[PDB]
């Protein structure tokens, strides 16, 4: 049942932003705390390594190039949630040089309150979008 979403106007056209973040294996191109990422299963699974060397494994669930979004689930991660599904989408901005990037997720809290899982997940999305904004500031 639990869900959360955060949005931000990124200062880049829909094409620039999706070009940058549309790649399932491209998180390190815009997320500083994810130094490296590799794909397995023909490109359906991504292995994300944080500075620690600890690796998170996520599965590609849906991808749509023209609607500019992809949905993924978590296979291996240290977050207190299960039944995790997340979608990041690049919607039309108010101008041709901006984008409304929306990051949302649905999950079931495990061992923590719905409120804590929600705050943790929202915090992850919010940090990522700020990082995306920074990437476009150059």
What residues make contact with a copy of itself under the rule CB under 8 A? Answer: 19, 22-26, 29, 39, 41-44, 59-66, 70
Question: Which residue, 26 or 133, is less far from a copy of itself as judged by CB?
Answer: 26
Residue 122 C-beta: closest distance to a copy of itself, Å: 24
Question: Which residue, 27 or 118, is less far from a copy of itself as judged by CB?
Answer: 27
Residue 71 C-beta: closest distance to a copy of itself, Å: 9
Residue 64 C-beta: closest distance to a copy of itself, Å: 5
**Cβ distance 85 to 1 under 8 Å?**
no
Q: Which residues of 18-115 form beta strands (DSSP E)?
A: 36-40, 45-49, 55-64, 69-76, 81-92, 99-109
Q: Which two tokens stand for residue 107?
A: 């999950």
For residues 27 and 46, give the distance between their C-alpha atoms in angstroms, rounded to a whole number.
10
């Amino acid at each position: 049942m639990a869900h959360t979403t955060t949005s931000m106007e990124i200062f880049g056209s829909t094409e620039q932003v999706w070009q940058l973040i549309g790649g399932f294996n491209s998180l390190p191109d815009w997320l500083p705390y994810i130094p490296s990422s590799k794909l397995t299963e023909g490109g359906r699974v991504r292995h994300l390594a944080n500075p620690d060397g600890e690796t998170i494994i996520e599965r590609l669930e849906v991808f749509n190039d023209k609607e500019r979004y992809y949905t993924y689930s978590i296979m291996n991660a240290p977050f207190p949630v299960t039944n995790y599904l997340s979608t990041i989408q690049v919607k039309e901005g108010t101008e041709s040089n901006t984008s409304l990037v929306e990051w949302s997720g649905t999950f079931t809290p495990v061992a923590v309150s719905d409120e804590e899982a929600i705050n943790l997940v929202h915090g992850i999305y919010s940090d990522g979008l700020k990082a995306l904004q920074h990437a476009f500031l150059d």
